[PDB]
């Protein structure tokens, strides 16, 4: 009867898109007086993480996950239909980072907030920066919460924080890209960071009660790190052109997968540099290496790919040299 | 009253993210014995299109639409929780086209089918080709329904049809990209085409009962049209490099223009692929009026198209006449 112990039966149904028994479990816990926050964190988010890990281990496909993610959204919808109305005044706007389509991160977070009596509008997946600030303005938002699932979205989170400051609004950030403490968040000028709803509820309720001062001076970022971000396309696509004159010829699917991986590589590298945390790049190499290992595609390809990136990457950002000379 | 007459009050709530009253309308109609299909088509789909048009007229932002789209998803979820189990055997797999993220087209369609007693798995937004086919295989899907909201996704729908054929599975297609008849669909090798669920229900129920022959011959397509598809990024990004030596732009504007030019080459390529000029002509009309309501001078796009000319015809000389048609 702990939410955690229901992950397996939930997944059994969720992975094949069998919504009804899986949302029934969700609602049975709720009716047995389990706090919603726990249901969301310990069952739904935990299940979704396991889906992601199975995909990652090449034990599931995107088709399975798509179904699992729909069931998760249906569970959140069911839960939301049980909620009493907001007890707190002051609208919190929850947004995925621009470029980020993990709507469910924003939605799970925002729903946990709702369950603490917050008035919450979840934009979910990627919205233009200027459209988010304009929404804050029109909807009289107290606070912006930005949910970021990969560190490759950081440049835009920084820009978004800046735009929000220009209109007086404070930004809390979170989700897995920001790690287990506030160092990455602080490096981008976020007014706050938290790991989950419990803490964010304190910060947000505090921003409602006492609307804090916000810089309006943009947080300093390494320009070379940003130029390396901007160039990720060019470097990847140009790396893949050479290589296929012809040191590995690769079908149209394989060339696109490689190209896509190398764009990601340069973006993790740029992100590591931007917020001065080497582990972002090192964790990516570990991550991708094992992604490919379960998929029986020789890693001479990616090695060759990284090899190719070397000369052009350092031409843009020489400070990335040292990051590359571990791998 | 009729579902159609509730569009305006539905939107009033949906566009500001006020889920509960808007989902309640959908459930009130259902309690008043209104068929689900009608609710979905006449209220939900109708509202979502009007959201689209307000966005298009620059009267709404993507932030407001994201709210409206969440409400629509929650409405479908509520309605789905009222359905009895399937009365029909034989699994229909509903997928957005690869590259297409309009999950709600697939979901609205699939849900109308469910309401006719079909067993349905909605993959929704973009899934890799080989993951869709592997799902069909593992789940023993009778039929694939592909939902396509832009004609720039056609090459991959063709590939997908081909993969489905290799495993003996028939494909119906639909969604707004396929127009008012079956000509575009047929040109890509689809085994059938329909406007909505009512017709597709007849075709699908017929495929369950009498399992049809499927061509293990790929539908013929012009390679130059495909090479022009493949090159869209290169041509756009390279067109925008020239033009900014310097005929006129901030980092936002350069990216918007670049993105519009990738679209231009893809609508052009799509028009060529299925031999329907109107795909490209409709796009020019569409984009021209998109920008007009946004007060961004159309000298820029003109100049952009102008720039594409030399490279585009170098790849596909058969596009020349389509380009000179315009201005
Ligand atoms: C489903 C899923 C997707 C779905 C999302 C669908 C949807 N509607 O959301 C789709 C299909 C879009 C997808 C696409 C991709 N994703 Co994905 N996928 C996931 C999965 C399984 C997450 C789904 C989810 O439900 N998240 C919601 C829950 C589980 O998140 P949470 O972190 O528990 O949220 C809590 C806390 O973070 C906190 N919190 C969250 N936000 C905020 C905000 C604030 C302010 C605060 C205080 C707190 C807070 O509170 C929440 C309380 O519940 C994960 C697995 C994972 N996250 O471990 C990946 C994962 C994030 N995806 C991944 C990848 C790689 C991809 C793709 C690049 C794959 C590809 N296409 O080739 C794309 C990128 C798309 C993009 N640009 O955003 C990787 C990232 C790996 C890495 N960084 O090295 C992951 C980790 C999977 C993996 N490898 O294990 N993905
Ligand atoms: C909401 C929305 C989005 C959302 C969708 C979120 C979601 N689905 O969860 C998001 C934000 C993802 C989005 C993004 C974009 N979209 Co959009 N947006 C829409 C909108 C408003 C979709 C509304 C929706 O709910 N669709 C479901 C309903 C309304 O669809 P329906 O067509 O009635 O479906 C029925 C029939 O077609 C049929 N049917 C449907 N599928 C199938 C399949 C089969 C097999 C059969 C037999 C029948 C069938 O039965 C259905 C049920 O009755 C439309 C507006 C519109 N459709 O006119 C655009 C629209 C499709 N989007 C558009 C654009 C431009 C974009 C973006 C390019 C914006 C951008 N990046 O700049 C991107 C493209 C993303 C991509 N696909 O890769 C344009 C396309 C323009 C064009 N020239 O083709 C539209 C038309 C808006 C407009 N009026 O300009 N979009
Ligand atoms: C992180 C999640 O993204 C999904 N995923 C991985 N690659 C793609 C893709 N090309 N398109 C759509 N979804 C994808 C998987 O289901 C994984 O679990
Ligand atoms: C076609 C639909 O897509 C949304 N839309 C338009 N541009 C973007 C973008 N850059 N990011 C996300 N959504 C967008 C609008 O809400 C519109 O209605």
Residue numbers in the entry:
A (entry chain B): 2 to 246, 249 to 252, 254 to 331
B (entry chain A): 2 to 246, 249 to 251, 254 to 332
Show the paper's wording.
Despite the low sequence identity (~34%), the structures of the two photocobilin proteins are similar, with an RMSD value of 1.63 Å for 464 C-alphas after structural alignment. Both the SasPcob and AbPcob proteins contain the W-(10)x-EH and E/DxH motifs in the B12-binding domain, which is found in other light dependent CarH-like B12 photoreceptors. The D ring is positioned out of the ABC plane by approximately 40° due to close interactions with Trp296. Although the putative BV binding globin scaffold is retained in AbPcob, the reduced BV affinity is most likely due to replacement of a key BV binding residue, Asp270 in SasPcob, with a His. The crystal structure of AbPcob revealed that steric hindrance by this His residue interferes with BV binding, unlike in SasPcob. Molecular dynamics simulations and ligand docking demonstrate that rearrangement of surrounding residues could allow BV to bind with AbPcob in certain conformations, where hydrophobic interactions with residues in the binding pocket (e.g., Leu252, Trp289, Leu294, Arg297, Val299 and Val303) contribute to retain BV in the correct orientation. The lack of the main binding interaction with the Asp residue in AbPcob may explain the absence of any obvious spectral shift and increase in absorbance at 700 nm upon BV binding that is observed for SasPcob. These findings could explain the lower BV occupancy levels for AbPcob whilst retaining the ability to respond to red light. Unfortunately, we were unable to obtain crystals of the full length AbDPcob protein or the light state of AbPcob.
Here we identify and characterise a sub-family of multi-centre photoreceptors, termed photocobilins, that use B12 and biliverdin (BV) to sense light across the visible spectrum. We have identified and characterised two types of photocobilins, one from Saccharothrix syringae (SasPcob) that represents a standalone photocobilin photoreceptor and a more complex protein that consists of a photocobilin diguanylate cyclase (DGC) fusion from Acidimicrobiaceae bacterium (AbDPcob) that is representative of a photocobilin domain fused to an enzyme domain. Crystal structures reveal close juxtaposition of the B12 and BV chromophores, an arrangement that facilitates optical coupling.
